[PDB]
Design a protein around this nucleic acid. Sequence first.
RNA 1: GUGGGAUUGUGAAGGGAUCUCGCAGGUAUCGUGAGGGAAGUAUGGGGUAGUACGAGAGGAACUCCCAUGCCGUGCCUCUAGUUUCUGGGGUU
Length: 137
Amino acid sequence: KDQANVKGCRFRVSVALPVGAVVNCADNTGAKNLYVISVKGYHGRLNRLPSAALGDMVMCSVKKGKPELRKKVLNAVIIRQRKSWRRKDGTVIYFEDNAGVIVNPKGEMKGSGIAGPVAKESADLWPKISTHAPAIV
RNA sequence: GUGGGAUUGUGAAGGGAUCUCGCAGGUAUCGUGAGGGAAGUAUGGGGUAGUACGAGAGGAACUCCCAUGCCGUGCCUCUAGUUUCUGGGGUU
Ligand SMILES: [Mg+2]
Ligand SMILES: [Mg+2]
Ligand code: NA
Ligand code: NA
């Protein structure tokens, strides 16, 4: 797909990462973490923090990492979350950590490698991440 | 008419008289539905299609069908939270 709007292409996933969450960066661009600024395709409700889950594209800034990647608004895709979600086949699953990868607004991954497993939901929404994943889980 | 009560405050006991009230409904279901309230609402993807239009750059929509926000009404199989079952352990 690699299209910014993903909600109508993937099933319900429990929201894990509200605005202000800091998640690890799984790529090798040089960034260490990502600061969730907002979530693509989020429709607001009064007082509700925009919250990301797997496969979502987020706006982010880099808080720790090499200087050229910092002090900017970047795009990123969530690939792991600690909050558990229920898959349609009934299985409840979660990751040990939260992680994301830096992308351009059209879904192309900056960086050429991914550390750790990628959720199947995220990989189905984004083929480039899927090809770079060392395991789809 | 029948019954039961009662008259105004200065004893007692019997007589009337006059009022007032009751005299037919209880109890248990299934329904009607006047009137009132009132609620669903959006986005995306597939396909149409890279085609109609267009020199070209670019570039649509509906039958359909697949999701997802929000809102609403519930529920507790699962997963999560909660424990004064102070349940069972452990430990100062
Ligand atoms: Mg507020
Ligand atoms: Mg319980
Ligand atoms: Na009515
Ligand atoms: Na439990």
